[PDB]
Amino acid sequence: QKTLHIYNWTDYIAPDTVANFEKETGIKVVYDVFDSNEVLEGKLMAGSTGFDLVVPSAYALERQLTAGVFQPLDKSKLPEWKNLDPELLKLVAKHDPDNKFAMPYMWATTGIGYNVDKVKAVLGENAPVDSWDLILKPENLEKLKSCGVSFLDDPEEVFATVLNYLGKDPNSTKADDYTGPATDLLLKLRPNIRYFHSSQYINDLANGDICVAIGWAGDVWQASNRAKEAKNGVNVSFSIPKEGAMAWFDVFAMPADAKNKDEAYQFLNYLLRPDVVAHISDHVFYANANKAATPLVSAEVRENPGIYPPADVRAKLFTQKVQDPKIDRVRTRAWTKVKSG
Numbered sequence: 001q002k003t004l005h006i007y008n009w010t011d012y013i014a015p016d017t018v019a020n021f022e023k024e025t026g027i028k029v030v031y032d033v034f035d036s037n038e039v040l041e042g043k044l045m046a047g048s049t050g051f052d053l054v055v056p057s058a059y060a061l062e063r064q065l066t067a068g069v070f071q072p073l074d075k076s077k078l079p080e081w082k083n084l085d086p087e088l089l090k091l092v093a094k095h096d097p098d099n100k101f102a103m104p105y106m107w108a109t110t111g112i113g114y115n116v117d118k119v120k121a122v123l124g125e126n127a128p129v130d131s132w133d134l135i136l137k138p139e140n141l142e143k144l145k146s147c148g149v150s151f152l153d154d155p156e157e158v159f160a161t162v163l164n165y166l167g168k169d170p171n172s173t174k175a176d177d178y179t180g181p182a183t184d185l186l187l188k189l190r191p192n193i194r195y196f197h198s199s200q201y202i203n204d205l206a207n208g209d210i211c212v213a214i215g216w217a218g219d220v221w222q223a224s225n226r227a228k229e230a231k232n233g234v235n236v237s238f239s240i241p242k243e244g245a246m247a248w249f250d251v252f253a254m255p256a257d258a259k260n261k262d263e264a265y266q267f268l269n270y271l272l273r274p275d276v277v278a279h280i281s282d283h284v285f286y287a288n289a290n291k292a293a294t295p296l297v298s299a300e301v302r303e304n305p306g307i308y309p310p311a312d313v314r315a316k317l318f319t320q321k322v323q324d325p326k327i328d329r330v331r332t333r334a335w336t337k338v339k340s341g
């Protein structure tokens, strides 16, 4: 009896995906979760994770490759690899040349999740729900403080969105951008932010406990779906703001010391099956990278422009750059200053 260990994001799989895999293959699966790239990268850099598959973002995969923490995917053991989107593969290939190490899993954006009715009650029906002004303008955050504001606990996301909102390069390589105007705005916003967290905001949005969040798109639509299932009358939506937004790709990768490579390949081939990965998108409200699976995804998910955004919305998106150690230092320092007010 072999056991496959999988380290994935929270709220990032269907409730029966793993059980259906165990039944089909006889492989026992141990499934652990994280809600942060730095948590996952920390384990990948510090020692032996014990995981056979992990799921980092494509840009973070690039940093991890330079340390040799992954092993190349044997394409002959992934016969269904052809189901993956070539335009999505080419986008991942900027971080993983020739797509040698990673399998694109899901992709989405980083925008604003919000309580529609409470926002409209606090800021009126003309609230800037189409703009980052909703959560990055201090005059607005001062009004929304009491209903609850959350930011992701992710320095790269927050700083990229703040610099973009200030008219700077989202991936600015000038330290004065981070210590100056980026830190200045965050400190003005900081007293109105209830907490920095990358997963608690899902149930807090669903229950009406926070009214505006920096959120990952599928996370927020899950919040909206849970509230509807609970019949609590809470109205949650998601905005890809008109100023542009962070877009990203999460990929499956195989750690270089993975114990059960053969079983890991079996799970990757399982994920490549169109019905399997469409079932996941139906439940997590995330776009998968499987071109063959798209028609099998629910109309509710596929026709949602906040999940499968149209071309006008795609033209506004930017992706995360791997910053050199100088900018990494500056950004990380300012982030810690910001978290402690």
Ligand SMILES: COCCOC[C@@H](C)OC[C@@H](C)OC[C@@H](C)N
Pocket (backbone or CB within 6 Å): 001, 019, 020, 022, 023, 026, 027, 028, 029
């Ligand atoms: C409470 O969770 C029990 C998991 O049960 C797995 C079910 C679906 O069957 C698949 C089995 C035969 O394969 C893996 C075995 C070794 N655990």
Ligand SMILES: [Cl-]
Pocket (backbone or CB within 6 Å): 057, 058, 059, 060, 247, 248, 249, 250, 319, 320
């Ligand atoms: Cl990415």
